[PDB]
């Protein structure tokens, strides 16, 4: 009956070799997973229709299926392609043939049903010379048969199989084999079976876009049917067979009209065209007639089709699309001219009539209608009743009738009563005679001037209106004004003279129906973007589709404020945002497993145990290391505008010169960018006047720096971590890349110097000279800088060193396993790479030209026509470069800001110690270490984080002998029995003494003072 097409039906669309590329092409392909009709050889095979292409396949073991018949009537009236493979001679014929009710060949042929006629043949080809059992099949032979404009293209692929089942699953491309140069109108076809298993399949092709994957051998190895489902659409949008987790905007939903609405005023009057075109006498050009035609039905098909007019040339309007337009008024200007004067009656034209007797507007939107009158206006011996004006002291404005017969003054001599020298009359006449030449016979010309629907129309063509349907998306036409939208009732009180409404934006808001005077609002039918929400293809092929800003009543289903989300399950439980949708809603792939939608969690809910006499003081701490990655530079580029736009073409370059400085301002802007990339790098890394190096003995107090210090054993003296970073981040069109001024080795040396300085001299090398200091003591200062007494470090030095070393190991494990850690830098590389690829792709665009390749234009057209096509390409390619450069300048500004930030951090974190909260990571900043990365810098921020807190009772002050004692440092705390004073960031209780506190005032002003004693040592 039917089977499922398992990705079969893919062929090489053309004869171009491609490799290691995903190419998007639109052609006639077999849709994926479509139904194909399953036919059998045993137990009589019908004739099927042919429809824009046929996919044919058969499975063979004994060559039972031997041929095909293609045509429309199969009755000797038309050409029909017949293909027969009779194990000896492959035969292709296009002869005319009368076939039997069931044509077949017996097993060599033993019966006569091969054919019965041989007449009117136009092509013959024969190739070289070269059982009936049932079972599993041995040979699968897939074919594609298509007819394009005149070429009958046959593609096929033969493959060994050992199977009985229908259409095995896998992927295999069909190569072309035959191209027959004959245009046959094919509407039906039939196959040919050998009669003493062997089934075959018939599918049908549709115009679909497919994404084809070419491997290293130029063999098509996979494909995506771009209209199979939202996931395939996503794949097409990203030009990849792997989709990262996220939400992509892939298409646009648009509601289509269901029916058309044609509305016109219910006027039954017919326009008096007969009284103008069929008139006894036409007027003279000096006094041409102008009849206004209005309030009538104008049938313009009769006048156009009548075979009586010498010319019918229309400007502004097309001569065929004239019935579906209507006018406020139409005027018919009717007069007789000489045949040779037809060329002068046109907008933009000049001559003795165009300037003196009939001038047209240069924006005229009408038609020039003409026919000869040699048998009507002409008279024997010359008909002298048609007057013209060959002299005038002034030029007519458009549509002026200069009736005045004043004596023309060719000079300053007196006239108007004189017909002597330089006083002549301007009116002269014609003698129309039946024997004069073609160019001298009279012609009756009527010019019909049509204005546009700038106001209510009264003259519409002979087409009946229809009824109006409300609240549905329709294609409406109100008095010739057309559009698409839903027509609804309205409460907008139009005044009797008002016909149309407008919005603030000048769009049509509403119209009054010309037959029944009610006001209808026009709301364009619902549309919106379509986004696909998907987990990465390494997890699941399930997707959800978001239809943006529409209701889901025209398209489980979850209505959100972002639109109606279909395919995602609504979950009451909140979670952390994963794939953002909008308006507080995120989606994720969770628990089998399915796509869910939920309101995002903003974090765990927590309350603080606040009271007026309780303070939490940390008793322990943790040293954490965070990684901050900043872009510093981007790949520097330089574009030769001439080679890009006008590659190796002198004429194109010469045309480019008419644009002045457009090139040099782009070369200059890109140069400026390239220079500042080196400035950015120099400002970030070259902040140290000398290149410092560590001692050979790494006696740093237990702190292990072997993973951030240069590794002397490497071919490039980079740190281990730097090597990890470099292993994660990954040209003849006038497009070049300049090298950076500072090579990676130089950057590594700069970071080495900064690390050695930081380690051996703390911050002193930044201000001036590098003053050596033991690392543990440096840390003591770093601790003092955050309000933690240096003795804490020394007492816990082993713990601190172990926590630091473990934190570093964790940094290494993260960088070694999570690629996304450096996404901030990879995207920059991708943005620049993408920008150039787009620019290159623009060279393939036509921009309105006959061809995108300039050399084919030059080799095909002579200069006088070729420069227009070239100018189109120059404009498009120049605009493309300008777009690129603007985007690069903006991106460069972003990079510069980032580089300035990185330099600021280098100075205030690595070279110093930062008091700016969260500037250099969360926690109390101690020190930072730079590491280089491709086109960027990585900072390792070492922070002190309070941990393991306890609830202590506290007090702002203690009364002793009536005096109020306040802490010099720390706060007063009580463990429930004894009062102590201790530092804010680390529990270290001390006896309260006069050397820890100070006295001011007495104990009667301060709120919360408690009674105690202060020990005097």
Ligand X SMILES: *[C@@H]1O[C@H](CO)[C@@H](O)[C@H](O)[C@H]1NC(C)=O
Ligand Y SMILES: *[C@@H]1O[C@H](CO)[C@@H](O[C@@H]2O[C@H](CO)[C@@H](O)[C@H](O)[C@H]2NC(C)=O)[C@H](O)[C@H]1NC(C)=O
Distances 42 to 4, 63, 134, 966 between C-alpha atoms, Å: 22, 14, 10, 107
- The whole-angstrom separation of Cα 882 and Cα 708 is 43
Residue with tokens 């051998």: 217
What DSSP state is assigned to residue 659? G
Q: Tell me: does residue 963 bind a second copy (CB under 8 A).
A: no
Q: Tell me: does residue 1011 bind ligand Y (CB under 6 A).
A: yes
Q: Residue from 523, 622, 635, 953 that binds ligand Y (CB under 6 A)?
A: 622
Residue 138 contact among ligand X, a second copy, ligand Y, none, beta carbon within 5 to 8 Å by kind: none
Q: Which stretch binds ligand Y (CB under 6 A): 305-313, 336-344, 662-670, 703-711?
A: 703-711
Beta-bridge partner residues of 622: 945
Q: Residue from 205, 911, 959, 1014 that binds a second copy (CB under 8 A)?
A: 911
Q: Tell me: does residue 594 bind ligand X (CB under 6 A).
A: no
Beta carbon of residue 850, minimum distance to ligand X (angstroms, whole number): 29
Q: Residue from 24, 35, 98, 601 that binds ligand X (CB under 6 A)?
A: 35
Q: Which stretch binds a second copy (CB under 8 A): 28-36, 143-151, 227-235, 956-964?
A: 956-964
Site for ligand X in 537-556 (CB under 6 A): 538, 551, 553
Residue 978 contact among ligand Y, a second copy, ligand X, none, beta carbon within 5 to 8 Å by kind: ligand Y
Residue 799 contact among a second copy, ligand X, ligand Y, none, beta carbon within 5 to 8 Å by kind: ligand Y
- The whole-angstrom separation of Cα 250 and Cα 252 is 7
Site for a second copy in 532-591 (CB under 8 A): 548-549, 561-562, 577, 580-584
Burial of 768 (0-12, 13-18, 19+ CB in 10 A): exposed
Residue 278 contact among a second copy, ligand Y, ligand X, none, beta carbon within 5 to 8 Å by kind: ligand X
Site for ligand X in 86-145 (CB under 6 A): 86, 88-89, 91, 108-109, 119-120
Q: Tell me: does residue 145 bind a second copy (CB under 8 A).
A: no
Residue 2 contact among a second copy, ligand Y, ligand X, none, beta carbon within 5 to 8 Å by kind: ligand X
Secondary element (H or E) of residue 873: helix 863-905
Site for a second copy in 169-188 (CB under 8 A): 175-176
Residue 1000 contact among a second copy, ligand X, ligand Y, none, beta carbon within 5 to 8 Å by kind: a second copy
Residue 567, both tokens: 């395919």
Phi first, then psi: what are they for 530, rounded to 5°?
-120, 120
Residue 694, both tokens: 């560590």
DSSP helix/strand/coil, 942: strand
Q: Tell me: does residue 185 bind ligand Y (CB under 6 A).
A: yes
Closer residue to a second copy in complex, CB, 400/795: 795
Q: Tell me: does residue 893 bind a second copy (CB under 8 A).
A: yes
Burial of 787 (0-12, 13-18, 19+ CB in 10 A): middle
Q: Tell me: does residue 17 bind a second copy (CB under 8 A).
A: yes
Contact 836, 944 (CB under 8 A): no
Q: After which residues is the chain broken (C to N over 2.5 A)?
A: 43, 107, 130, 196, 555, 591, 730
Q: Which stretch binds a second copy (CB under 8 A): 142-150, 301-309, 810-818, 999-1007?
A: 999-1007
Q: Tell me: does residue 664 bind ligand X (CB under 6 A).
A: no
The set of residues, in sequence order, having a beta carbon less than 8 Å from that of 478 and lying 6+ positions away, is: 263, 511, 513, 514
Q: Residue from 977, 1007, 1016, 1017 that binds ligand Y (CB under 6 A)?
A: 977
Sketch the per residue contact string, 935 through 964, with ligand Y: x for CB under 6 A, - otherwise.
Answer: -------------x----------x-----
Beta carbon of residue 975, minimum distance to ligand Y (angstroms, whole number): 4
The set of residues, in sequence order, having a beta carbon less than 8 Å from that of 358 and lying 6+ positions away, is: 285, 288, 333, 335, 345, 396
- The whole-angstrom separation of Cα 464 and Cα 476 is 14
Beta carbon of residue 802, minimum distance to ligand Y (angstroms, whole number): 5
Residue 734, both tokens: 């006038």
Contact 571, 580 (CB under 8 A): no
Site for ligand Y in 467-496 (CB under 6 A): none
Q: What's the per-residue H, E or C state across 54-94?
A: EEEEEEECCCCEEEEEEECCCECCCCCEEEEECCCEEEEEC
Residue 617 contact among ligand Y, a second copy, ligand X, none, beta carbon within 5 to 8 Å by kind: a second copy
Distances 103 to 88, 131, 201 between C-alpha atoms, Å: 19, 20, 19
Sketch the per residue contact string, 264 through 283, with ligand X: x for CB under 6 A, - otherwise.
Answer: --x------xx--xx-----
Q: Tell me: does residue 886 bind a second copy (CB under 8 A).
A: yes
Q: Tell me: does residue 930 bind a second copy (CB under 8 A).
A: no
User: Which is nearest to 311 in space by CA: 337, 273, 330, 349?
Assistant: 337
Binding positions for ligand X, rule: CB under 6 A: 2, 35, 76, 84, 86, 88-89, 91, 108-109, 119-120, 217, 266, 273-274, 277-278, 302, 306, 515, 538, 551, 553, 572, 609, 611-612, 949-951, 1007-1008
């Amino acid at each position: 009956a039917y089977t499922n097409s398992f990705t079969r039906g893919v062929y090489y669309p053309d004869k171009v070799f491609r490799s290691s590329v995903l190419h998007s092409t639109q052609d006639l392909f077999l849709p994926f997973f479509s139904n194909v009709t399953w036919f059998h050889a045993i137990h009589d095979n019908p004739v099927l229709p042919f429809n824009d292409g046929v996919y044919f396949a058969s499975t063979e073991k004994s060559n039972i299926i031997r041929g095909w018949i293609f045509g429309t009537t199969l009755d000797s009236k038309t050409q029909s392609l017949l293909i027969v493979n009779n194990a000896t001679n492959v035969v292709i014929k296009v002869c005319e043939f009368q076939f039997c009710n069931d044509p077949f060949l017996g097993v060599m042929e033993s019966e006569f049903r091969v054919y019965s006629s041989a007449n009117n043949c136009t092509f013959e080809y024969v190739s070289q010379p070269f059982e009936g059992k049932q079972g599993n099949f041995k040979n699968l032979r897939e074919f594609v048969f298509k007819n394009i404009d005149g070429y009958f293209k046959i593609y096929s692929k033969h493959t060994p199989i050992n199977l009985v089942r229908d259409l095995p699953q896998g992927f295999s491309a069909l190569e072309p084999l035959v191209d027959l140069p004959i245009g046959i109108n094919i509407t039906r076809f039939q196959t040919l079976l050998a009669l003493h298993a062997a089934a075959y399949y018939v599918g049908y092709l549709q115009p679909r876009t497919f994404l084809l994957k070419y491997n290293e051998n130029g063999t098509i190895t996979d494909a995506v049917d771009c209209a199979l489902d939202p996931l395939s659409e996503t794949k097409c949008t990203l030009k990849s067979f792997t989709v990262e987790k996220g939400i992509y905007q892939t298409s646009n939903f648009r509601v289509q009209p269901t029916e058309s609405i044609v509305r016109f005023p219910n006027i039954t009057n017919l326009c008096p065209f007969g009284e103008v075109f069929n008139a006894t006498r036409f007027a003279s050009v000096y006094a041409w007639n102008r009849k206004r035609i209005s309030n009538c039905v104008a049938d313009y098909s009769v006048l156009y089709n009548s075979a009586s007019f010498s010319t019918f040339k229309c400007y502004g309007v097309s001569p065929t699309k004239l019935n579906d337009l209507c006018f406020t008024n139409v005027y018919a200007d009717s007069f007789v001219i000489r045949g040779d004067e037809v060329r002068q009656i046109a907008p933009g034209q000049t001559g003795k009539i165009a300037d003196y007797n009939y001038k047209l507007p240069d924006d005229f939107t009408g038609c020039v209608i003409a026919w000869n009158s040699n048998n009507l206006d002409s008279k024997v011996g010359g008909n002298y009743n048609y007057l013209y004006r060959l002299f005038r002291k002034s030029n007519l404005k458009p549509f002026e009738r200069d009736i005045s017969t004043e004596i023309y003054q060719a000079g300053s001599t007196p006239c108007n009563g004189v017909e002597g020298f330089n006083c002549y009359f301007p009116l002269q006449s014609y003698g129309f005679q039946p024997t004069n030449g073609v160019g001298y016979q009279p012609y009756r010309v009527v010019v019909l001037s049509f204005e546009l629907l700038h106001a209510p129309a009264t003259v519409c063509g002979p087409k009946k209106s229809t009824n109006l349907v409300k609240n549905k998306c329709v294609n409406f036409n109100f008095n010739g004004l057309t559009g698409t939208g839903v027509l609804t009732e309205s409460n907008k009180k139009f005044l009797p003279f008002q016909q149309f409404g407008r919005d603030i934006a000048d769009t049509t808001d509403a119209v009054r129906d010309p037959q029944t005077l009610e006001i209808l609002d026009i709301t364009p039918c619902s549309f919106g973007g379509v986004s696909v929400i998907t987990p990465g293809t390494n997890t699941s092929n399930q997707v959800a589709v978001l239809y943006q800003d529409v209701n889901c009543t025209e398209v489980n289903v979850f209505q959100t404020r972002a639109g109606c989300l279909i395919g995602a399950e609504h979950v009451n439980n909140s979670y952390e945002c994963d794939i953002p949708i909008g308006a507080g809603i995120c989606a994720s792939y969770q628990t089998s497993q399915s796509i869910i939608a939920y309101t995002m969690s903003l974090g765990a809910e927590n309350s603080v145990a606040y009271s007026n006499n309780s303070i939490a003081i940390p008793t322990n701490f943790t040293i954490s290391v965070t990684t901050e990655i900043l872009p510093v530079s981007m790949t520097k580029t330089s574009v030769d505008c001439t080679m890009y736009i006008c590659g190796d073409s002198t004429e194109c370059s010469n045309l480019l010169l008419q644009y002045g400085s457009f090139c040099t301002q782009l070369n200059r802007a890109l140069t400026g960018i390239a220079v500042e990339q080196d400035k950015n790098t120099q400002e970030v890394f070259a902040q140290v006047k000398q290149i410092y190096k560590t001692p050979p003995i790494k006696d740093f107090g237990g702190f292990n720096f072997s993973q951030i210090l240069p590794d002397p054993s490497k071919p490039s003296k980079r740190s281990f971590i730097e090597d990890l970073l470099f292993n994660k981040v990954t040209k003849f069109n006038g497009l070049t890349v300049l090298p950076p001024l500072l090579t990676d080795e130089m950057i590594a040396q700069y970071t080495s110097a900064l690390l050695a300085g930081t380690i051996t001299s703390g911050w002193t090398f930044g201000a001036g000279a590098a003053l050596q200091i033991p690392f543990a003591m440096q840390m003591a200062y770093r601790f003092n800088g955050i309000g933690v007494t240096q003795n804490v470090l020394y007492e816990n030095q082993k713990l601190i060193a172990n926590q630091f070393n473990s934190a570093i190991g964790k940094i290494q494990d993260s960088l070694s396993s999570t690629a996304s850690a450096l996404g901030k830098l990879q995207d920059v590389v991708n943005q620049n790479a993408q920008a150039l690829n787009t620019l290159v792709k623009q060279l393939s665009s036509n921009f309105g030209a006959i061809s995108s390749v300039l050399n084919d234009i030059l080799s095909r057209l002579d200069p006088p026509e070729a420069e227009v096509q070239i100018d189109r390409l120059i404009t498009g390619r120049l605009q493309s470069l300008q777009t690129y450069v603007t985007q690069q300048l903006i991106r460069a500004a972003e990079i510069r800001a980032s580089a300035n930030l990185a330099a600021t951090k280098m100075s205030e974190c690595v070279l110093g110690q930062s008091k700016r909260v969260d500037f250099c990571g969360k926690g109390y900043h101690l020190m930072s270490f730079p590491q280089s990365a491709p086109h960027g810098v990585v900072f390792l921020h070492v922070t002190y984080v309070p941990a393991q807190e306890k609830n202590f009772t506290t007090a702002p002050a203690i009364c002793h002998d009536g005096k109020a004692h306040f802490p010099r440092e720390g706060v007063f705390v009580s463990n429930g029995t004894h009062w102590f004073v201790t530092q804010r960031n680390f529990y270290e209780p001390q006896i309260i003494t006069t050397d820890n506190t100070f006295v001011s005032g007495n104990c009667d002003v301060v709120i919360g003072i408690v009674n105690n004693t202060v020990y005097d040592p």
